[PDB]
Amino acid sequence: VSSFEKFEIFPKTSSWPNHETTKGVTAACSYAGASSFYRNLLWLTKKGSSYPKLSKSYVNNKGKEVLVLWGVHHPPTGTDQQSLYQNADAYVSVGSSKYNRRFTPEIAARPKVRDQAGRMNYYWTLLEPGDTITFEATGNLIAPWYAFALNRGSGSGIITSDAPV
Amino acid sequence: KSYVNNKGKEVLVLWGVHHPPTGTDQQSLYQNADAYVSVGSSKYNRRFTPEIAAR
């Protein structure tokens, strides 16, 4: 990939009216001494007490591949599940024309990594010129916020080096 | 059960998960019709179910 165009696939301030999009946010993604989160994904929590089925679709009209990234949260014994997403029996489903996977919360307490005892899984898929991608979820979705239109070329690729630029 | 690796080297841990045939046997061994087995470390993490099935 020799270039891309980042774009906001589901704008944060416009996409999620009946879900909570603001706070949080974790200590583990701290920016300048305050809790934060990834710039390119959105941790959607329940808007006081309810978390209805969301269904967002996006159609790839960029005329090139779109890289979409998202996450699925697995809270520790929750409680936390209930306190974030309400729905004890929640699911997250992502499908396109090609790809298709169904994720569950997997309530499980794990050795604290960055003071955190839940885990978050990260996924990606390349959406082909033309295709639709549908997200359906009743909790645990770390929704995409920004995504990438890819340009393939001979500007490929990746090195590890400590030489100065 | 938890174990902390203080050997100052890698520890290989092995375990099993049983899938009984139509049980009954499940009930007769483990009581809990709706049982689960969860193993996690800092790196690894998997959740197993009985998969009652006669083979």
Q: Tell me whether B41 touches chain A (CB under 8 Å).
A: yes
Please name every residue paired with A141 in a beta bridge, in sequence order, or none if there are none: A72
Q: How far, in Å, CA of A91 to CA of A103, rounded?
A: 6
The answer to whether the peptide bond before residue A26 is cis (omega within 30 degrees of 0) is: no
Is-contact B40 A108, C-beta < 8 A?
A: yes
Q: How far, in Å, CA of A141 to CA of A104, rounded?
A: 10
The domains of chain A, with CATH numbers, are: 1-165 (3.90.209.20)
Q: Which residue has the tokens 């996977």?
A: A101
Q: Tell me whether A119 touches chain B (CB under 8 Å).
A: yes
Residue A116: CB atoms within 10 A of its CB come to 14
Do residue A113 and residue B42 have CB atoms under 8 angstroms apart? yes
Which technique was used to obtain these atomic coordinates? X-ray
Handedness of CA A39, A42, A43, A48 (dihedral sign): positive
Cβ-Cβ contacts under 8 Å between A and B: the total is 15
State the amino acid at position B54 in one-letter form: A
Q: Which two three-digit tokens encode residue A54?
A: 């969301």
Three-state DSSP state, A14:
helix
